[PDB]
Structure formats: C-alpha cells, structure tokens
Design a binder for this molecule. Structure first.
Ligand SMILES: [Mg+2]
Ligand SMILES: [Mg+2]
Ligand SMILES: [Zn+2]
Lengths: 147, 201, 98, 124, 245, 46
RNA sequence: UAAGUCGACAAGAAGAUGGGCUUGGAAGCAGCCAUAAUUUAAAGAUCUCGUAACAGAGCACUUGUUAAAUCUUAAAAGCAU
C-alpha cells in the first residue's frame, strides 16, 4: 500500500540527515532525488524555515509530496515575540495553565488565519471559525489573547 | 429462532421428500417420540435425517420453498431443535447440489501428501488412503470414509470433497490431529484458511 | 461481501421505481478504493417518465460475466450469488498458491 | 480605540517568504466585524463566600414565580417544533436554519462528556 | 415545590424518548422540510472525510461567484450539502404530509403552581402525529398518489441533501455543475480557472455522488426536470416575459 | 488453565460456557478466550 | 422496539495538529500542563494493542444493509450450580 511519512525540514535545507535521511532512506525511494525536488518547491522561503511535508510513497517507490504551511505553534510563538529558548528557537510554556510566554493580539490572528487558508484543502473553511481554532491552540502554548 | 422462519430455497434439481410420523419400537424405553424421515435427493447424492414430529414443514412445491415451524415456541427443547434442524437442511440442500469442500495446507520442511490405494487395509473395495509424511518414523495413512473424494493438487495441499459436511469436516479434523499448528514457526496442518499468531522471536 | 474479484459493474435503472432498490443497495457495498484499483463502473439514470427494466451487469477478473435481473431478486439474493463465485476463486487461488 | 495594536504596527515574524516584509497592522475599521467577537469563547475564602455569596444567594432568590427556579430543561432535550414555516420567506428560513445549527452544537457538546466519561471508566 | 402532574413547557409528552438522537434528529428534518423549498436528493457511496471536505470546498467557491448586488440577504453560506438519516428522514415526509396540527383538541395543563392551563400538543413528536401517520400509511395505493409516495423509492440507502433557502436558479447552475454536470446546459468548471476542482481527491469524490432526485415547493421532481428549473436564468425575469404578451 | 472459585471475564472475547456436563456429571463453568490463552479458567474440581 | 430494538456485516471514524513541555526520540497512546474551540452524517488534544520514534490495526462515535409484531437491556428477590 502507498505509505505516507511526516517530516519537518528547513526551507531550502534538504540533505541526507537525521531529519531526512532515516525518515525516507529506509523505505527505498531516492532520498537525494527528493531533496532535489524539494529545493525547487521551496525557492522563495527564508533559508532554515521549518516546513511540514507529507510525502506519499506509491508502490515501486515512486513518491509525490505536497509541502504545507509552517506549523501554527511555530507561528504564534514567532509572532508572540516570546523569549528565545535553549536550542535556537522559541519555546512554549511548560504549564500553560499559569505560565504565559506572551500575549498575541487578535490583529495577528486574522493574519495567521489567512496564511493557513492559502492551502487548497483548507481554502473552503470559513475564515471566521479559523480565528477561533488558533485561539484554542493559544491556550495550549501559554499565549494569551489581547483584544 | 430467526433462522427457522427463513424459508429454504430449493434450487433446481433438489427434491425433498417428507416421510410420515413413525415410532421405532424400543424395548429399553417405555415411550419413543415420533420422528419424520426427510430425504433430500439431487444430482450428487441423497441425504436423510430424522427430525422430531413437532417440527412442521410446509413443503410448497409450486414456489420451491419449505419453511419450518414448531408447535410451541415457549419450550426450550423446541426452540433449540428448530434452529438446528434448519441449519442441517441448509447444509443438505447446499451439499447435494454444489458439494462441501475442505482445503488442508501442510506447512513445514518435509511435509508431503499423496493419494493412492492400500488394498491391504481397505475397509471397502477401492478405498483411497491419504498418505502423509509428517516427520514421523512411521507412515501415516488414513482411509477416506465411503462417500468422500480426496485429491492433492500439490504435495502440500489436500482437497476433500463430499456431500455431508459433518463427515468432511470431521475427517479434516482427524488429519489435522497429527500435526496441530504451532505458534513458533507455523508448522502444522491448517484447515480452510485457518491461521495462527506467531512469536516475534 | 468481497469486491476484490469483481472487475467492473454497469447499472442502468430508474430511481423513482421501487424495483430499483436492490440496484442502488448493491452499489453502496463497493469499497471506496474500488475506482483507483482499476474497477471500471458506469451508472446510468433513466428518466422518471419512461421506465425501462433495470439492468445490473457484473464481471469478475476470471472472465465470468454475471447478469442478474433486479426486479425479481432482492438485495439479499444478489450478494449470495456474487460472493458464491468469489468463494471458489479464493480457494482456487490458495490451491494454486505455494 | 478597541484594538491594543494601532494601525501601522509591524506584525513580527508572520512572513516566511524571502522577497517580502512582515505584515503591517491595518486600520481597525478595515478589519471584519466578527474579529471583535471571536473572543466570546474564553470560559476563610469560603467563609467570605458564606457571609457574602451565600448571603446574597438566599435573598437573590425572590421566590415569587415557581417556574423561575424550574429545572430549566436544556436545548438538547426539548420537543417543541423548531421555527420552521412553509413558504414563510427567506428571512424566517435563514433564521430557521440558525437554530438547526444551534441544536447541533448542543448535541455536539453532550457527546464530549459522554465520550470522555466512557473513556474515563476504562482507564480507572 | 414542583407537583407531580407538572411538566416543563418546552417538553410536552412525546410519542417516544426525546433525549435520543433518533427523535431529536426528526424535529430537525421536519423544520427543514418547511423552511427549504428547494431540495436535491443525492446518494453517497462510502465517501471519506477528506473527500467530503473537498466536495464542500468547491461549493463554497462556486457559490461565492454568484452576482447578488441587490442588497439581498447574505445567501451564500446557509447552503449546505448535508447527510441525512434516510430512515428518520423518511418519517419526516410522512409527518409533513399526513399530519394536520389543527386537528388536535387542547387539554388542561398543570403548571408548577398546580393551576390547570389549557394546552394543545401539536409537536411533530406527539402521539397524535405518530398515530395519524401510521393509520394514514395503512392504505397502500392512496399513499402512492401523494408526494411522499413519489419520493419514497429515492430514500433508500445512504442519501445526502443540498438545502437551498429558496428557489434561486443562479445558485442551482453553480451547484448543479459541481455535483452533476451535464454540458452544454450545466458545464463543469474550467480547468484554466478552477484547478482545485480537478484534484485527485475532489475528482474521486464526485464519482461517488449520484444526483437521484429533487423536491421543490412540496412537489416531486426528476433529474431531467431539475434542469428545466435551473435552466431559467431568473424567476422574476420569467414572469416579466409573460407580461409582455 | 487456572482453576478458580471466582471466574471472571478479562476482555471482550472471553465467553462463559458450561462444558463436560452429561448424564453422569453436572460439569464446570469455563472462561474460553480465543484471543489470549491465559484467560482460560475453570470453576470447580473433578 | 417497524421512528427497525438486539446481534452481525460494509464503510467512515476528518481538519487546525507531530497540542506545549520533557527527551537521544515522545507524532492521540513514558511523564508534566492545558483540554473555552472548530467543522461534520458523526470524530476523546485520546479508551485498548502496536513502533526506537512514525506508520498501522481496533474503540468511543456515525450512516447504511440484513432483520423480530408478546422475542431489548439492567437491577432486585426466590430456588439451584
Ligand atoms: Mg508513545
Ligand atoms: Mg503528546
Ligand atoms: Zn479474553
């Protein structure tokens, strides 16, 4: 059966490595071939930006993938101006119940919802309900919402 | 019984003959319960059974159907035999028309099977003896009951055939009794797609 | 029901006719992946004014071409005759497998 | 004067494209209306309540009408016909389709507890 | 305190349990069969979630390109391709057809105060509706003459419905081409302008949908007849043509 | 097989049956399980 | 409980999203915190297996088919095993 794998890789950083090497090198497809195509797919994004991928490995090891917008968590934190944590990246609240890394305004939400609406599979969802989907995730990453 | 109410479709060629209530005298019992001799004849053969009298069969030939009914649904004895008598007729009808089959798969290194004659131990003239090499010092031979046909398309595959399902499956269980599937390598005799979960080690 | 051994089925019926019941029910049992797997299917819908007898065509991967009338047979009577032939193909495959 | 971020504010880190700058905050009026309403979903110490809360508890009752303290059946257990009328018009029709979607949430909310609780009874 | 005879005002005696999804879903369809003049009945065949979302995504796009500059209500989002419970949805039609609420005798109703207040039970989940429906259905041929009889054969197996707040021919051509295209009348969207419609998943979903029939202004309609309705450019315009004569 | 005085089902596939009951003995209550053979139980001694 | 009970079978069981933290790794399913939402015929930031981690197979839940006209499920009590 045509298998699928989830991967988070940099913008234009596709190479045999922990993120890409073992994720696909074990099935049988040409890992180096994928990195050649992913680079062409991502030629307008800042180098190093994380980009989730869903590569569908058809039988005979013929793969076709569809790059997806950055994670919502990475956007809220990147936009919340939260303090940088160990590892060269922002970290969310360990216990969102009390701790608060930042407070994103609704004006940011309306922009975080559109960038997530550019996807076709999510192009039909009404934008209104999409602002409340991230607000429901802000409570999980210790981010407050200021009107 | 939701199965006893379901009519029994009699396919073309099958003929059901319902006898009359009879009581075979028994000196060891003071009262024998009457039964009904039901014959199911067709292309492949003829099967007969004796059902209790309280089971009523309204054999309507114009539509080629036969429904069962009991005299009292509240009796535990009548509810049970109502469904059992129906399941047996369904097997009889589908056994004399098409026939029942059982496939045995012999897994393991050195497991074979052949179908040849053994005139020395023949219970009846021309009895077929299934010979099995199952890693035993002695050869395993079993005579197919009268009325069955055993074949071997491949060395590691047996095919039993017969009009009586109980006789076919009972014989398939006797051959499997020599090598029951083990859970470590799958070696054994599997009947009708039977499987066994293996150990990871 | 097993649709693995079924290659292609063609149905022509009238929806407003109560006799086309079994035709529509049979169409539902087909799995989701029957299309991409290569099983061709073409469903024709007849007008309500003119009513032609429903036609249910079936064909397996072994050349068998089944054609059962929908008006006379019920949905329960259609599946048994379908899986019946699908039962011999499975055991025949096993007998030839290995 | 309803937004904390005024117009022109630069939304930090919301543009991952190379040849582009981060979005800039637009006027509050240009924004849609529902945004100012999407935040509608955010929901001795007892001796103090005993003398203050439980005090206000009793006198707030004002038991004049019995129905006022009735069980107040929820929306997911009623049997009154929904506001649906034949050839009534587009307005009532639209308003009629709003309650059908409201009752949807009522049943939806009840499935979480019924699904969560049953999951709790299996992981005791 | 509350007496024994008292019953809540918004929970009259029903013919069967109310909290159950069986009856609670019947009340929805009955109001849907009154507020929605135009309805199309489909038949889905094992559609996955991602496929359903794709079919509902195109309608949101095709229905968003309808010209409505007349200040008319925002009729672009109350149109939904909804899956219905065929069994209960079938009882809904019987209720709307063979039940007249004006044939109920009001009876005294005891409130929390114990006083008797006259009340009438007309809710569709009432024992009278259940009783009127059964007896009315006892007749075999008289039922076939009704609209219900002309639609019962369609309510077999799984069915999905497209509810439109009212008859708008412009909205049909935008929704009929995305679910049951038939050129040149209702041509499918162009690939050079709607590349999402011709997607592997969206294309694999429409093949499982089959437009069976429709119901307009409480009148049965066949797939061929729906085209005639949708063929009209506009309802108000059609009336003007007759006035010129 | 574990002979207990209080036999109980341990999963969804465990079934309670009374076997070895005939014209000579009353039999025992069993807990048969085709999934896990460790769920086999018996009530009463021979 | 014919508004189809009960059982089985067929398919579905989504999406924001690998929630945040932790960790060599923690993607519903080691542990910690949160668990207002959203869209659906329905879909727990996850009830039981599974993976180094994914994947995958089930469940809750949902529609459909088969199908009962005294025939569903539970509790209590009496006598028995
Ligand atoms: Mg884990
Ligand atoms: Mg986790
Ligand atoms: Zn068990």
């Amino acid at each position: 059966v045509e298998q699928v794998v989830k991967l988070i890789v940099g913008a234009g950083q596709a190479s045999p490595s922990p993120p890409v090497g073992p994720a696909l090198g074990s099935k049988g497809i040409k890992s180096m071939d994928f990195c050649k195509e992913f680079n062409a797919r991502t030629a307008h994004i800042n180098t190093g930006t994380p980009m989730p991928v869903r590569v569908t490995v058809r039988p005979d090891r013929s793969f076709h993938f569809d790059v997806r917008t950055p994670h919502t968590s990475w956007l809220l934190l990147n936009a919340a101006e939260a303090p940088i944590g160990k590892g060269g990246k922002r970290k969310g609240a360990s216990n969102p119940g009390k701790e608060v890394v930042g407070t994103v305004s609704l004006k940011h939400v309306y922009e975080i919802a559109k960038i997530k609406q550019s996807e076709l599979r999510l192009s039909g969802l009404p934008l209104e309900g999409l602002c409340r989907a991230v607000i429901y995730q802000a409570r999980s990453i210790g981010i407050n919402v200021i009107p | 019984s939701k199965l006893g109410r379901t009519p029994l479709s009699i396919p073309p060629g099958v003929e059901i003959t319902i006898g009359e209530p009879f009581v075979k005298r028994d000196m060891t019992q003071w009262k024998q319960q009457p039964k009904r001799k039901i014959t199911v004849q067709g292309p492949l053969g003829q099967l007969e059974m004796d059902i209790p009298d309280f089971i009523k069969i309204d054999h309507d030939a114009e539509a080629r159907r036969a429904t069962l009914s009991v005299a009292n649904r509240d009796e535990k004895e009548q509810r049970e035999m109502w469904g059992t008598t129906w399941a047996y007729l369904n097997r009889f009808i589908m056994g004399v028309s098409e026939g029942h089959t059982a496939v045995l798969r012999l897994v393991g290194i050195g497991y074979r099977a052949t179908i040849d004659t053994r005139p020395e131990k023949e219970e009846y003239p021309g009895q077929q003896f299934v010979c099995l090499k199952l890693g035993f010092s002695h050869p395993v031979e079993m005579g197919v009951p009268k009325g069955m046909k055993a074949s071997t398309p491949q060395p590691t595959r047996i095919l039993l055939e017969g009009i009586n399902r109980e006789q076919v499956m009972t014989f398939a269980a006797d051959i499997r009794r020599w090598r029951v599937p083990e859970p470590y390598k799958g070696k054994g005799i599997f009947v009708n797609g039977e499987t066994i979960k293996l150990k990871q080690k | 029901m097993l649709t693995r051994f079924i290659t292609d089925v063609s149905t022509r019926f009238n929806p407003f006719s109560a006799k086309a019941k079994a035709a529509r029910l049979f169409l539902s049992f087909l799995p989701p992946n029957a299309r991409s797997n290569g099983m061709n299917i073409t469903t024709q819908l007849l007008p309500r004014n003119s009513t032609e007898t429903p036609l249910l065509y079936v064909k397996f991967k072994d050349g068998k071409e089944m054609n059962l009338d929908v008006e006379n047979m019920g949905i329960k009577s259609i599946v048994e005759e379908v899986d019946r032939h699908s039962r011999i193909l499975q055991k025949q495959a096993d007998l030839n497998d290995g | 004067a309803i937004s904390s971020c005024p117009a022109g504010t630069k939304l930090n880190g919301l543009n991952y494209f190379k040849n582009k700058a981060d979005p800039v905050a637009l006027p509050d009026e240009e924004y849609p209306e529902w945004l100012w309403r999407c935040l509608e979903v955010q929901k001795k110490q007892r001796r103090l309540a005993m003398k203050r809360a439980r005090a206000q508890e009793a006198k707030i009752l004002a038991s004049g009408d019995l129905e006022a303290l009735a069980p107040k059946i929820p929306l997911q257990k009623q049997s009154v016909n929904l506001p649906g009328a034949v050839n009534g018009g587009v307005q009532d029709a639209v308003l009629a389709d709003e309650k059908r979607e409201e009752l949807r949430k009522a049943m939806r909310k009840e499935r979480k507890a019924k699904i969560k609780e049953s999951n709790y009874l299996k992981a005791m | 305190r509350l007496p024994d005879d008292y019953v809540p005002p918004t929970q009259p005696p029903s013919a069967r349990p109310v909290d159950t999804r069986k009856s609670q879903l019947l009340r929805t369809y009955t109001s849907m069969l009154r507020s929605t003049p135009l309805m199309l009945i489909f038949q889905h065949n094992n559609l996955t979630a991602i496929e359903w979302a794709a079919i509902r995504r195109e309608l949101s796009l095709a229905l968003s390109n309808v010209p409505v500059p007349e200040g008319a209500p925002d009729i672009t989002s109350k149109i939904h391709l909804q899956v219905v419970r065929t069994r209960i949805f079938d009882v809904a039609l019987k209720t709307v057809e063979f039940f007249d609420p004006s044939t109920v005798e009001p009876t005294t109703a005891t409130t929390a105060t114990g006083t008797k207040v006259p009340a009438t039970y007309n809710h569709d989940l009432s024992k009278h509706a259940w009783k009127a429906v059964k007896e009315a259905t006892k007749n075999t041929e008289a039922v076939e003459k009704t609209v219900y009889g002309q639609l019962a054969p369609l309510l077999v197996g799984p069915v999905a419905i497209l509810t439109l707040p009212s008859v708008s021919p412009a909205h049909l051509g935008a929704a009929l081409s995305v679910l049951a295209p038939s050129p040149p009348a209702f041509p499918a969207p162009s690939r050079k302008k709607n590349p999402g419609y011709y997607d592997l998943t969206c294309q694999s979903g429409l093949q499982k949908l089959l437009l069976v029939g429709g119901r307009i202004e409480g009148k049965a309609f066949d797939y061929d007849g729906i085209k005639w309705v949708g063929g009209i450019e506009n309802g108000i315009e059609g009336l003007r043509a007759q006035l010129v004569h | 097989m574990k002979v207990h005085s209080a036999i109980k089902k341990r999963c969804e596939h465990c079934k309670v049956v009374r076997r070895k009951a005939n014209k000579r003995q009353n039999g025992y209550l069993y807990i048969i399980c085709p999934a896990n053979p460790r769920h086999k139980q018996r009530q009463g001694y021979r």
